[PDB]
A paper describes a structure:
Here we use in vitro experiments to demonstrate that three proteins, [name], CgnC and CgnE, are sufficient for the production of the hallmark tetracyclic crocagin core from the precursor peptide CgnA. The crystal structures of the homologues [name] and CgnE reveal them to be the founding members of a peptide-binding protein family and allow us to rationalize their distinct functions.
[name] was recalcitrant to crystallization until a slight molar excess of CgnA was added prior to crystallization trials. Curiously, [name] contained a dinuclear metal centre that was partially occupied. The binding sites comprised [name] residues Glu161, Glu252 (shared between Zn2+ 1 and 2), Glu274 and His280 (Zn2+ 1) and His291 and Asp293 (Zn2+ 2). As expected for homologous proteins, the Cα root-mean-square deviation (r.m.s.d.) between the structures of [name] and CgnE was only 1.2 Å over 284 residues. The aminopeptidases form an extensive dimer interface, and the residues involved in its formation are largely missing in [name] and CgnE, which rationalizes their monomeric state in the crystals. The leader peptide is enriched with positively charged amino acids, and both [name] and CgnE show a large, strongly negatively charged patch near the possible binding site. Hydroxylation at the Tyr20 Cβ position allows [name] to catalyse an elimination reaction via its bound Zn2+ (or Co2+) ions, which results in a double bond between the Tyr20 Cα and Cβ atoms, creating a conjugated amine. The CgnE homologue [name] on the other hand appears to possess catalytic activity.
Numbering used by the authors: 0 to 303
């Protein structure tokens, strides 16, 4: 059972089997010094298989990987970009971001942030013109927090870049949000091709707006009640895409990014890498009938 830092040092040193699902992306990966093997040729089931990094670009392959979880018997994480933007531009950006960052530095902030959620009942997020409060319940649901990677467990890399609390069982099974959050940009995640066809165009509009000025999201009783992007109120567009669907405005994720990205971020690119941006991000939607939006505030400071 390999240690997480042991895993990523090998990733930095190109000592991992790079499993790839779209071979048209092979040249960009091999140009970065990795030996690539197609997805359908790597035996995740064999226990002696070498420690692997899987890049899933396609939703059908994202499903094939999920089919192999209970059968997996070795060491593997995977960067799942199938549910975000899967263009070469997004893929090159995601890999450049991952391969440039300081992993050990990221994992300790992550460890420290979990040392903060467990102890405290209240968190205050201060952004330039806003303050957000988070009241953790007595029973919080969290994303996998293993620091030594277990055998047969398919780790999503992203969960190594953030400390994430989520309201999965019910609307407020873990935490409640009241107040405002001024954020930098956003990403959005869709689990189905049906949803991605409907919302992607709109969500990309919202992302580009986020570059044009003040971004602010407001919560009352853990329900999103206002969404300002580029200094303009878009709450009407928010309601059209959440009303009458799933839990509507219920916040679904409260998480803390732990990555000091050395390379410039691009907030027009819907890549999961941006969710790990050092700071705070809030989640709305489950990616089923509403895209799971993540309003990400970078330089945000925390208060207990
Ligand atoms: Zn998150
Ligand atoms: Zn999220």
């Amino acid at each position: 059972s390999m240690d997480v830092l042991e895993y990523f040092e090998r990733l930095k040193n190109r000592e991992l089997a790079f499993v790839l699902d779209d071979l048209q992306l092979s040249d960009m990966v091999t140009r970065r010094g990795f030996s690539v093997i197609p997805f359908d040729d790597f035996d995740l089931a064999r226990e002696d298989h070498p420690p692997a990094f899987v890049l899933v670009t396609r939703l059908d392959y994202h499903g094939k990987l999920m089919q192999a979880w209970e059968t997996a018997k070795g060491i593997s994480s995977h960067l799942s970009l199938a549910k975000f933007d899967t263009s070469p531009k997004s893929v090159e950006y995601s890999l450049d971001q991952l391969l440039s960052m300081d992993f050990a530095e990221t994992l300790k902030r992550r460890g420290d942030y979990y040392d903060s959620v467990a102890s405290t009942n209240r968190m205050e997020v201060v952004t330039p013109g806003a303050v957000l409060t988070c009241d953790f319940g007595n029973e919080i649901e969290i994303a996998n927090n293993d620091v030594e990677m277990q055998k047969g467990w398919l780790y999503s890399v992203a969960e190594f870049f953030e400390t994430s609390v989520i309201n999965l069982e019910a609307d407020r099974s873990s935490y409640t949000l009241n107040g405002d959050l001024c954020f930098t940009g956003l990403i959005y995640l869709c689990n189905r091709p049906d949803l991605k066809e409907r919302a992607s165009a709109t969500m990309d509009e919202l992302m580009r707006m986020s570059t044009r000025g003040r971004n602010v999201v407001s919560f009352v009783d853990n329900q999103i009640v206002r969404m300002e992007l580029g200094g303009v109120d878009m709450t009407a567009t928010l309601r059209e895409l959440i009303v009458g669907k799933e839990r509507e405005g219920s916040s679904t994720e409260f998480a803390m990014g732990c990555v000091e990205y050395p390379l410039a971020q691009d907030w027009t690119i819907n890549s999961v890498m941006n969710e790990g941006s050092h700071g705070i991000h809030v989640g709305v939607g489950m990616g089923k009938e509403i895209p799971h939006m993540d309003f990400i505030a970078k330089g945000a400071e925390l208060r207990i």
